[PDB]
Design a protein around this ligand. Structure first.
Ligand SMILES: *C(=O)CCCC[C@@H]1SC[C@@H]2NC(=O)N[C@@H]21
Lengths: 84, 192
């Protein structure tokens, strides 16, 4: 046997990450790198074909990172925001 | 017309015409003319093959999942786009479940599109009915499905379960009246 020489995931079990739930394109990013966020707060607007999931806030804290810019393509189970 | 009839569409006019031969009432139209149309649309349809649904046969299981015949090919393209081509039998199954989850509602546009979106979403994430019964999991539900529990599409006869609805919208909640009598008129002049 010889070898012929020719995007980050997320977690859906323990820690409070935000994984993509419908695969599509990112339309708007509202939350920056260092910014305070409260309950239910919209963070990320992503769009499919006839679908629109505006991502809310499950907890109440400070943003660690943003994993998508403007117009970036996402799959199901992809890291977007990680939160404590 | 014959070649644009059947399955998820409506009955053939050409077929119905002959079906009434002998019976008291006849169909008022042109036989030979519809035949002529059928042959034309038979060829024209050939242009649109890429959009043909995955039904080639009558399905009696539609009596189970009550999916609108207009939504069908539209929703197939939606599942195809969302990485759910091949997995469309499971989308039909969930559609049935999404209905009894909402207290047995009427499924047409856009209420069909809500069940339609709730079905596509829950399959995508391997969710089920008890995934939100004692759970009530925050999940980032699609536009249409939260919109429906706000009442943006009206009120269903049996309503929604008080506790069911709640955990789907925590925060700015439900509105009671027909949307029109608070939603203020659009200024068409500023649009011009
Ligand atoms: C995409 O822009 C075309 C519209 C596809 C949705 C249509 S609207 C009427 C049918 N009912 C439904 O739930 N979806 C179908």
């Amino acid at each position: 046997y010889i070898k012929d020489e020719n995007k980050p995931k997320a977690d859906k079990s323990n820690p409070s990450h935000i994984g993509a739930q419908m695969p599509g394109s990112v339309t708007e990013v509202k939350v920056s790198v260092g910014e305070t966020v409260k309950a239910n707060q919209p963070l990320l607007i992503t769009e499919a074909m006839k679908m629109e999931t505006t991502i809310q806030a499950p907890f109440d804290g400070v943003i660690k990172q943003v994993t998508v810019n403007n117009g970036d393509t996402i799959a199901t189970g992809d890291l977007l925001i990680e939160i404590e | 017309v014959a070649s644009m009839s059947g399955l998820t569409s409506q009955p053939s006019a050409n077929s119905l015409y002959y079906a009434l031969n002998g019976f008291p009432r006849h169909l008022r139209t042109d036989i030979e003319g519809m035949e002529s149309l059928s042959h034309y649309w038979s060829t024209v349809r050939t242009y649109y093959s890429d959009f043909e649904s995955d039904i080639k046969s009558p399905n009696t299981e539609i009596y189970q999942h009550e999916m609108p015949g207009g939504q069908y090919s539209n929703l197939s393209q939606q599942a195809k786009s969302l990485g759910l081509g091949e997995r469309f039998d499971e989308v039909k199954d969930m559609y049935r479940r999404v209905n009894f989850l909402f207290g047995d509602i009427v499924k047409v546009a856009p209420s069909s599109k809500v069940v339609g979106d709730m079905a596509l979403y829950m399959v995508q994430n391997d969710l089920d009915e008890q995934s939100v019964i004692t759970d009530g999991y925050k999940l980032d539900f699609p536009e249409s499905v939260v919109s429906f529990f706000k009442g943006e599409i009206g009120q269903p006869v049996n309503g929604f379960n008080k506790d069911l609805q709640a955990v789907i919208l925590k925060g700015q909640e439900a509105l009671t009246a027909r949307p029109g009598e608070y939603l203020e008129p659009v200024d068409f002049e500023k649009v011009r």
